Enzyme design. Structure first.
Site, mmCIF file in Angstrom:
data_model
loop_
_atom_site.group_PDB
_atom_site.id
_atom_site.type_symbol
_atom_site.label_atom_id
_atom_site.label_comp_id
_atom_site.label_asym_id
_atom_site.label_seq_id
_atom_site.Cartn_x
_atom_site.Cartn_y
_atom_site.Cartn_z
ATOM 1 C CG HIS A 175 29.276 -1.176 -17.452
ATOM 2 N ND1 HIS A 175 28.565 -0.175 -16.825
ATOM 3 C CD2 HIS A 175 30.470 -0.634 -17.791
ATOM 4 C CE1 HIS A 175 29.297 0.924 -16.789
ATOM 5 N NE2 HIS A 175 30.457 0.673 -17.370
ATOM 6 C CG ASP A 232 25.600 -0.577 -15.340
ATOM 7 O OD1 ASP A 232 26.191 -1.603 -14.942
ATOM 8 O OD2 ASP A 232 26.139 0.282 -16.061
ATOM 9 C CB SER A 270 32.626 2.384 -16.203
ATOM 10 O OG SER A 270 32.440 2.729 -17.555
HETATM 11 N N1 LIG Z 1 29.396 9.709 -19.324
HETATM 12 C C1 LIG Z 1 29.841 9.263 -20.499
HETATM 13 N N2 LIG Z 1 29.494 9.874 -21.625
HETATM 14 N N3 LIG Z 1 30.707 8.118 -20.560
HETATM 15 C C2 LIG Z 1 31.188 7.340 -19.411
HETATM 16 C C3 LIG Z 1 30.349 6.087 -19.181
HETATM 17 C C4 LIG Z 1 31.201 4.812 -19.262
HETATM 18 N N4 LIG Z 1 30.422 3.654 -19.735
HETATM 19 C C5 LIG Z 1 30.547 3.066 -20.938
HETATM 20 O O1 LIG Z 1 31.365 3.479 -21.769
HETATM 21 C C6 LIG Z 1 29.628 1.849 -21.291
HETATM 22 C C7 LIG Z 1 30.405 0.565 -20.872
HETATM 23 C C8 LIG Z 1 29.750 -0.730 -21.389
HETATM 24 C C9 LIG Z 1 29.749 -0.753 -22.942
HETATM 25 C C10 LIG Z 1 29.593 0.636 -23.634
HETATM 26 N N5 LIG Z 1 29.235 1.839 -22.779
HETATM 27 C C11 LIG Z 1 28.557 2.920 -23.340
HETATM 28 O O2 LIG Z 1 28.264 3.910 -22.648
HETATM 29 C C12 LIG Z 1 28.106 3.015 -24.849
HETATM 30 C C13 LIG Z 1 26.586 3.413 -25.047
HETATM 31 C C14 LIG Z 1 25.533 2.235 -24.926
HETATM 32 C C15 LIG Z 1 26.169 0.775 -24.855
HETATM 33 C C16 LIG Z 1 25.054 -0.320 -24.911
HETATM 34 C C17 LIG Z 1 24.078 -0.134 -23.709
HETATM 35 C C18 LIG Z 1 23.432 1.288 -23.755
HETATM 36 C C19 LIG Z 1 24.554 2.381 -23.708
HETATM 37 N N6 LIG Z 1 28.914 4.076 -25.516
HETATM 38 C C20 LIG Z 1 30.395 3.993 -25.711
HETATM 39 C C21 LIG Z 1 30.953 5.331 -26.180
HETATM 40 O O3 LIG Z 1 30.178 6.262 -26.504
HETATM 41 O O4 LIG Z 1 32.194 5.495 -26.239
#
Ligand SMILES: N=C(N)NCCCNC(=O)[C@@H]1CCCCN1C(=O)[C@@H](CC1CCCCC1)NCC(=O)O
Ligand SMILES: *[C@@H]1O[C@H](CO)[C@@H](O[C@@H]2O[C@H](CO)[C@@H](O)[C@H](O)[C@H]2NC(C)=O)[C@H](O)[C@H]1NC(C)=O
Ligand code: NA
Ligand code: NA
Lengths: 249, 27, 10
Positions: free
Chosen positions: A43, A99, A198
């Site tokens: 992602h 992912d 990420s």
């Molecule tokens: N460890 C934690 N708590 N956060 C860090 C992870 C970073 N990844 C993302 O934000 C990803 C990046 C891609 C889009 C959004 N997303 C998210 O985690 C979403 C939740 C869901 C998105 C759709 C697929 C299933 C997971 N949340 C964003 C948020 O809570 O701010």
């Protein structure tokens, strides 16, 4: 990283920062697995919902860093990408299943006191370390809070959580290619990865051969460091077959 | 190879400030 | 707020 601490110098020599060329900014975390290969979350490169679809030329990887924003002269090394490889079954439509992505550098990077590759787990390593209660380490230059930015690389150790508990903490469908980590409310301690973290590594130090192994990749979470919630990570070993196929080319 | 062995820690037999927390969790 | 990197890195 929320509720973490400043990393020590050379504490995470495999840490990689994905950097966007044009609007120079932090894109994601990543890890160095050899002198020419970098591992990260799919992602970080491809995510249609947000119109993200980077090509080799849109970014750079900065290795050997500590400071988030400064150009660390004589320490960090900046590399260009030759090719990006995203898992063919990466599920960006529903739950970020599989992912994971690989990035081949144009030229091998030189190892140093601050640049060194992390190990990838074998079946036995995974089997023995991936247990509820066992703690791993997550690092990144992401947000210090859900709703700011750190001066230097942040680090936090978090325990792997039982699958039933991970499942019952979210409405998202969990798969075998994921695992979650983080403290429970009754455990007191806190910590979690956050926006910007990420693609970063979730590592564990084998008590058997005393080497660091990357067991997970920062994938997703709901909010950051929320009670009752956990961070989810890509299960690296479960996808190692794909990784090896790509590297073997 | 020498993967997972940090130049400033394992290679010099120096431990970082929190790695012991990890070891202690591997019960 | 990132420091400019060497131009040689494009
Ligand atoms: N460890 C934690 N708590 N956060 C860090 C992870 C970073 N990844 C993302 O934000 C990803 C990046 C891609 C889009 C959004 N997303 C998210 O985690 C979403 C939740 C869901 C998105 C759709 C697929 C299933 C997971 N949340 C964003 C948020 O809570 O701010
Ligand atoms: C994401 O970007 C890539 C390119 O970086 C797109 O891939 C294209 O796929 C078509 C297949 O019909 C090829 O003909 C093109 O050469 C590829 N590159 C480009 C720049 O078009 C891809 O379609 C984009 N979208 C998605 C969802 O992956
Ligand atoms: Na659920
Ligand atoms: Na939590």
């Amino acid at each position: 990283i929320v509720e973490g601490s400043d990393a020590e110098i050379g504490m995470s020599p495999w840490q990689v920062m994905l950097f966007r060329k044009s609007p120079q900014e932090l894109l994601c975390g990543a890890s160095l697995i050899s002198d020419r290969w970098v591992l990260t979350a799919a992602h970080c490169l491809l995510y249609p919902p947000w119109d993200k679809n980077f090509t080799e030329n849109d970014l750079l990887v900065r290795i050997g860093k500590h400071s988030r924003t400064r150009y660390e002269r004589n320490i960090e090394k900046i590399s260009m990408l030759e090719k990006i490889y995203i898992h063919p079954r990466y599920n960006w439509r529903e739950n970020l299943d599989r992912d994971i992505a690989l990035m081949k550098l144009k030229k091998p990077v030189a190892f140093s006191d601050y640049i060194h590759p992390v190990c990838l787990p074998d079946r036995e390593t995974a089997a023995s370390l991936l247990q509820a209660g066992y703690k791993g380490r997550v690092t990144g230059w992401g947000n210090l809070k859900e709703t700011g930015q750190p001066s230097v690389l942040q680090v936090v150790n978090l325990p792997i959580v039982e699958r039933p508990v991970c499942k019952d903490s979210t409405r998202i469908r969990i798969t075998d290619n994921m695992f979650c980590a983080g403290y429970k409310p009754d455990e007191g301690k806190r910590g979690d990865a956050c926006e910007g973290d990420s693609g970063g590594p979730f590592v564990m130090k084998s008590p058997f051969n005393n080497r660091w192994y990357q067991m997970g990749i920062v994938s997703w979470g709901e909010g950051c460091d929320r009670d009752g919630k956990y961070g989810f990570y890509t299960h690296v070993f479960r996808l190692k077959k794909w990784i090896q196929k790509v590297i073997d080319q | 190879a020498d993967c997972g062995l940090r130049p400033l820690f394992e290679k010099k037999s120096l431990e970082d400030k929190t790695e012991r927390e990890l070891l202690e969790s591997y019960i | 707020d990132f420091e400019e990197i060497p131009e040689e890195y494009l």
